[PDB]
Amino acid sequence: SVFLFPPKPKDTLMISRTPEVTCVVVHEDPEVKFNWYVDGVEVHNAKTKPREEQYNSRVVSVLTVLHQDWLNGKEYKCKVSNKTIEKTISKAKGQPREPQVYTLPPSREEMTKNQVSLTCLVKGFYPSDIAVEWESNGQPENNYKTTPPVLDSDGSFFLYSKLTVDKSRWQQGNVFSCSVMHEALHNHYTQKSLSL
Template identity: 25%
Template structure:
């Protein structure tokens, strides 16, 4: 009994010291932040675990993103309404400090710390204990692909670049493939650059040589990323940049042109794209108002065909006239296709050569020939050798017409 009474002051002294010095009790305080790394998809909810145990210590509890001068308060248990995206996992708990961050985005990537503060002599918050930190990576899907091509149309045989871009993805690793009509084509290595808030952008380019039959074709960019359940695909229609100039044929019918007959000049435009084309007709450089146009015909592989024609009366004053078809395709420089109208049986003096040829074959040699020469004074007959056999002038030599075509492309 005496011994107990002697030790009582010592126990009271120890209790007194314990109550006056919070640091002694704080040695039993423990903060546990178990997660080292967390991977979460953008738009999902991030859970950060933190628990405490031991004796209570006066002071605030916060979640910080980053450490040092650039840290940012993510949640303060004293003012929860100031952080609308963050909620506590167990409300009102003194030991479970786990939080949920809703709708995380790539900019939420970083290292998070669960921190316990205490008060100094001036009543200020000072660090008491912190967790070891949880590194958070926010997986972000690539944005929809943008596939672009040349700004101007090009002719078949030219090699042109097509570019595929996407951005805002994490992690950095990404795969890119190119196809032309589902056939793989080789492309340059993609260029990957770091963007803001730990995300990345990608650009890939492929060179494609356009062909005449590429109107219905397309190039496709395919992107694979760890965040995607299926690859992203974006396409570009080659018809948007392809220009196929028309192949033009100039015709005149009938081929044998006689005086006062009608000859039809036809301009046939074949295998062209795009279909916008304008046609005009000229006679000796002057526009002809009477013209006809066929229905636009679509051929295989998306090309087009069009026919235009004009009728000309083969009058004597039109002999030697130039008939031109002027084609303007897709706003390009005009292409001129022309033919010359030759009329074979045009009158020379008082004679028509075609009639003369027939007469000579039927008439008696001698007196009739002499009579014609003397009466008509035909210069054409004066150039004939004398005597001339009746069969030497065949009607065909005078009656065949001719239309020649030329192109000034």
């Protein structure tokens, strides 16, 4: 069993982070080998994290990739070997489309609660690789949860991010902002603010 994983969306969009692809493999002294190919041609800058013994009786190899390589759609072939299995992944193919970002205040009806919901609708983006964060006065907020991307009826994706705050923090007029990073956006990043 060989499983290939893509880099984190955030890591491919900021030139300062390190986007990896993670080839996971998953007890009679099994040796394993690893060959990495980028659009067919092989590369020798992988790294094999040390063996992991599981409760059921999990070797991993990690290859750093270039930001513009992943985003241009190059195929990443991970080839195992044990005395032969392959996997390939790439970015989803297609014209990237720019997320529209809309912040939605809490319902009047929710205002009878002690905490309230601040909503960030992110729609019309493609491919589904995206990252969403919340902050206020520069410091990130922690109490938020973001739905997975959902396929919309036009072949673009959407998601919602919900930020839970004390109603008083909302009543006091604090500024909350939803951050979105996506490849189709200008400088890969956009912000939208929400206040009372």
